[PDB]
DNA sequence: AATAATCTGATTAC
DNA sequence: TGTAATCAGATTAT
Protein backbone atom coordinates (compact mmCIF):
# COMPACT_ATOMS: atom_id res chain seq x y z
CA UNK A 1 0.00 0.00 0.00
CA UNK A 2 1.20 3.44 -1.14
CA UNK A 3 0.53 6.72 0.57
CA UNK A 4 -2.52 8.37 -0.91
CA UNK A 5 -1.71 10.56 -3.97
CA UNK A 6 -1.31 14.22 -3.01
CA UNK A 7 -3.57 16.51 -5.02
CA UNK A 8 -1.72 19.75 -5.60
CA UNK A 9 -3.90 22.87 -5.89
CA UNK A 10 -3.33 25.36 -8.75
CA UNK A 11 -1.91 27.94 -6.35
CA UNK A 12 0.59 25.24 -5.10
CA UNK A 13 1.40 24.19 -8.66
CA UNK A 14 2.08 27.80 -9.65
CA UNK A 15 4.53 28.21 -6.83
CA UNK A 16 6.31 24.94 -7.86
CA UNK A 17 6.36 25.78 -11.61
CA UNK A 18 7.89 29.18 -10.80
CA UNK A 19 10.57 27.56 -8.67
CA UNK A 20 11.17 25.03 -11.45
CA UNK A 21 11.92 27.86 -13.86
CA UNK A 22 14.60 29.21 -11.44
CA UNK A 23 16.11 25.74 -11.09
CA UNK A 24 15.15 22.17 -11.97
CA UNK A 25 17.41 20.98 -9.18
CA UNK A 26 16.68 23.08 -6.05
CA UNK A 27 18.80 22.40 -3.02
CA UNK A 28 17.54 21.26 0.36
CA UNK A 29 17.01 24.82 1.68
CA UNK A 30 14.99 25.74 -1.41
CA UNK A 31 12.92 22.53 -1.19
CA UNK A 32 12.21 23.12 2.48
CA UNK A 33 11.31 26.77 1.92
CA UNK A 34 8.86 25.66 -0.73
CA UNK A 35 7.36 22.93 1.48
CA UNK A 36 6.80 25.51 4.23
CA UNK A 37 5.30 27.90 1.68
CA UNK A 38 2.84 25.35 0.21
CA UNK A 39 1.97 23.40 3.34
CA UNK A 40 3.52 20.28 1.79
CA UNK A 41 6.35 18.08 3.04
CA UNK A 42 9.83 18.41 1.58
CA UNK A 43 9.39 14.82 0.42
CA UNK A 44 6.36 15.55 -1.75
CA UNK A 45 8.30 18.54 -3.19
CA UNK A 46 11.26 16.40 -3.95
CA UNK A 47 9.06 13.85 -5.72
CA UNK A 48 7.25 16.64 -7.74
CA UNK A 49 10.54 17.90 -9.08
CA UNK A 50 11.75 14.36 -9.86
CA UNK A 51 8.62 13.74 -11.88
CA UNK A 52 8.70 17.20 -13.38
CA UNK A 53 12.26 16.58 -14.59
CA UNK A 54 11.15 13.27 -16.04
CA UNK A 55 8.27 14.72 -18.15
CA UNK A 56 10.48 17.58 -19.36
CA UNK A 57 13.20 15.11 -20.36
CA UNK A 58 10.58 12.96 -22.04
CA UNK B 1 25.09 22.08 -3.99
CA UNK B 2 23.68 21.51 -0.54
CA UNK B 3 21.88 18.30 0.27
CA UNK B 4 20.16 17.26 3.50
CA UNK B 5 22.74 16.52 6.22
CA UNK B 6 23.21 12.81 6.83
CA UNK B 7 20.81 11.50 9.38
CA UNK B 8 22.39 9.54 12.22
CA UNK B 9 20.41 6.66 13.61
CA UNK B 10 20.74 5.69 17.28
CA UNK B 11 21.39 2.04 18.29
CA UNK B 12 17.73 2.03 19.51
CA UNK B 13 16.36 3.36 16.19
CA UNK B 14 18.70 1.01 14.26
CA UNK B 15 17.55 -1.99 16.22
CA UNK B 16 13.92 -1.06 15.58
CA UNK B 17 14.56 -0.54 11.84
CA UNK B 18 16.37 -3.85 11.32
CA UNK B 19 13.86 -5.91 13.22
CA UNK B 20 11.24 -4.32 10.93
CA UNK B 21 13.37 -5.13 7.90
CA UNK B 22 13.52 -8.78 9.06
CA UNK B 23 9.73 -8.91 9.28
CA UNK B 24 9.36 -6.97 6.01
CA UNK B 25 11.63 -5.45 3.33
CA UNK B 26 8.81 -3.55 1.68
CA UNK B 27 6.95 -1.89 4.55
CA UNK B 28 3.75 -0.30 3.40
CA UNK B 29 2.88 3.24 4.24
CA UNK B 30 1.19 2.30 7.50
CA UNK B 31 4.19 0.32 8.69
CA UNK B 32 6.68 3.08 7.82
CA UNK B 33 4.45 5.58 9.57
CA UNK B 34 4.26 3.29 12.60
CA UNK B 35 7.99 2.89 12.59
CA UNK B 36 8.30 6.67 12.40
CA UNK B 37 6.28 7.01 15.58
CA UNK B 38 8.27 4.39 17.48
CA UNK B 39 11.65 5.77 16.53
CA UNK B 40 10.90 9.51 16.22
CA UNK B 41 12.39 9.71 12.72
CA UNK B 42 10.26 11.20 9.96
CA UNK B 43 8.71 8.66 7.62
CA UNK B 44 10.68 10.20 4.76
CA UNK B 45 13.96 9.07 6.40
CA UNK B 46 12.46 5.64 7.07
CA UNK B 47 11.65 5.11 3.40
CA UNK B 48 15.18 6.11 2.45
CA UNK B 49 16.64 3.79 5.10
CA UNK B 50 14.74 0.83 3.67
CA UNK B 51 15.86 1.74 0.15
CA UNK B 52 19.49 1.81 1.18
CA UNK B 53 18.94 -1.31 3.32
CA UNK B 54 17.62 -3.37 0.33
CA UNK B 55 20.64 -2.15 -1.64
CA UNK B 56 23.13 -3.26 1.07
CA UNK B 57 21.37 -6.62 0.95
CA UNK B 58 21.75 -6.88 -2.85
CA UNK B 59 25.40 -5.78 -2.90
CA UNK B 60 26.39 -8.29 -0.23
CA UNK B 61 24.81 -11.17 -2.02
CA UNK B 62 26.43 -10.43 -5.40
CA UNK B 63 29.72 -9.87 -3.62
CA UNK B 64 29.97 -13.20 -1.87
CA UNK B 65 28.53 -15.15 -4.84
C1' DA C 1 35.17 3.85 3.40
C1' DA C 2 30.33 2.82 4.93
C1' DT C 3 26.09 4.47 4.01
C1' DA C 4 22.46 8.78 3.97
C1' DA C 5 21.15 11.49 0.16
C1' DT C 6 20.14 12.36 -4.71
C1' DC C 7 19.28 11.35 -9.33
C1' DT C 8 17.16 8.79 -13.58
C1' DG C 9 14.79 5.54 -15.71
C1' DA C 10 11.10 2.47 -15.61
C1' DT C 11 7.01 1.32 -13.54
C1' DT C 12 2.84 1.21 -10.70
C1' DA C 13 -1.57 2.86 -9.36
C1' DC C 14 -4.83 5.75 -9.03
C1' DT D 1 -5.88 10.33 -18.10
C1' DG D 2 -1.67 12.51 -16.51
C1' DT D 3 0.71 12.23 -12.69
C1' DA D 4 1.93 11.02 -7.83
C1' DA D 5 4.26 7.17 -5.65
C1' DT D 6 7.52 3.57 -5.76
C1' DC D 7 11.15 0.80 -6.99
C1' DA D 8 16.29 -0.70 -8.51
C1' DG D 9 20.45 0.88 -9.92
C1' DA D 10 23.90 3.98 -9.99
C1' DT D 11 26.20 7.69 -8.01
C1' DT D 12 27.52 11.66 -4.86
C1' DA D 13 29.51 12.85 -1.02
C1' DT D 14 29.77 13.09 4.29
From Swiss-Prot, chain A:
Where DNA binds (residue ranges)? 1-58
Query: Where located?
Result: Nucleus
Sum up the protein's function in the record's words. Pair-rule protein expressed in a segmentally repeating pattern to define the polarity of embryonic segments. Capable of sequence-specific DNA-binding.
Q: Which family does it belong to?
A: Belongs to the paired homeobox family.
Q: What is this protein called?
A: Segmentation protein paired
Per the UniProt record, the source organism is: Drosophila melanogaster (Fruit fly)
Residue span relative to the full protein: 213 to 270 of 613
From Swiss-Prot, chain B:
Report which superkingdom the organism of origin falls in: Eukaryota
- S-S bridge residues: none
The listed locations are: Nucleus
Q: Which residues bind DNA?
A: 2-61
Family note? Belongs to the paired homeobox family.
Q: What does this protein do?
A: Pair-rule protein expressed in a segmentally repeating pattern to define the polarity of embryonic segments. Capable of sequence-specific DNA-binding.
Can you say what this protein is called? Segmentation protein paired
Q: Which residues of the full protein are shown?
A: 212 to 276 of 613
Amino acid sequence: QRRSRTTFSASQLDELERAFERTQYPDIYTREELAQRTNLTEARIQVWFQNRRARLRK
